[PDB]
């Protein structure tokens, strides 16, 4: 990092929630390259359940971890909207499989609380870099699949890489009142 032109530091350091490595997208589909680097995150697996349905089962387990159920006595609460992993099939439709990823604050990042839910697991190390896009429309699950495809095509003319069968989505808020909710789909960079 910065070759050998580094000064005395390491003690106190500030890390942005996202690292902008590029900008500019398109009038039809705008995207931005952002790299996130943390420490520990809360992952929840949900089978035999779609995305919206799974989150309903995942949120309770993941919420208890951030709320007051970690067998420690900490007050995490919450932090920004949660993101989940979705594995799109060749048919364009998911196959019941979603993993809810939680962003733990630097405060607990150094030593997060011991999970109480056997379903809630914390993964150490391994950062992910994805691109976020903002559009004016609704999106539940199958609709997201269409959005994730657009981003891929958009980056088609760029060095931007991806996984191939897994991406993340952002929303949280349910599709009720328009002009107030924002849906975004981030692809996992390979």
Burial class (CB in 10 A: 0-12, 13-18, 19+), 114: exposed
Q: Nearest Cα to 30, choosing from 159, 137, 131, 130?
A: 131
CA 178 to chain centre: 23
At 119 the three-state DSSP class reads coil
Hey, CA dihedral for 124, 105, 132, 90, is it positive or negative?
positive
Hey, CA dihedral for 112, 114, 120, 125, is it positive or negative?
positive
**Method in brief:** NMR
Contact between residue 62 and residue 42 where contact means Cβ atoms under 8 Å apart: yes
Each domain of the chain, given as residue ranges in start order, spans: 16-190
- DSSP per-residue codes, 72-114: S-------S--EEEE---TTSS--SEEEEEEE--HHHHTS---
Place of tokens 């903002």: 134
Place of tokens 């975004």: 184
At 4 the three-state DSSP class reads coil
Contact between residue 164 and residue 61 where contact means Cβ atoms under 8 Å apart: no
56: CB partners within 8 A, 6+ apart: none
Contact between residue 40 and residue 108 where contact means Cβ atoms under 8 Å apart: yes
CA atoms of 43 and 3, how far apart (whole Å):
35
Q: Class for domain 16-190, per CATH?
A: alpha beta
């Amino acid at each position: 990092m910065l070759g050998m032109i580094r000064n005395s530091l390491f003690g106190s350091v500030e890390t942005w929630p996202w690292q902008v490595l590029s900008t500019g997208g398109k009038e039809d589909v705008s995207y931005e390259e952002r790299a996130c680097e943390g420490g520990k995150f809360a992952t929840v697996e949900v089978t035999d359940k779609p995305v919206d349905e799974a989150l309903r089962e995942a949120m309770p387990k993941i919420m208890k971890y951030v709320g007051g159920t970690n067998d420690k006595g900490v007050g995490m609460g919450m932090t920004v909207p949660v993101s989940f992993a979705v594995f799109p099939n060749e048919d364009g439709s998911l196959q019941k499989k979603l993993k809810v990823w939680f962003r733990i604050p630097n405060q607990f990042q150094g030593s997060p609380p011991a999970p109480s839910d056997e379903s809630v697991k914390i993964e150490e190390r391994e950062g992910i870099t994805v691109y976020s896009t903002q559009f004016g429309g609704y999106a539940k699950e199958a609709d997201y699949v269409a959005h994730a495809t657009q981003l891929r095509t958009t980056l088609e003319g760029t060095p931007a890489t991806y996984q191939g069968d897994v991406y993340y989505c952002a929303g949280y808020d349910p599709p009720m009142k328009p002009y107030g909710r924002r849906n975004e789909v981030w692809l996992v960079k390979a």
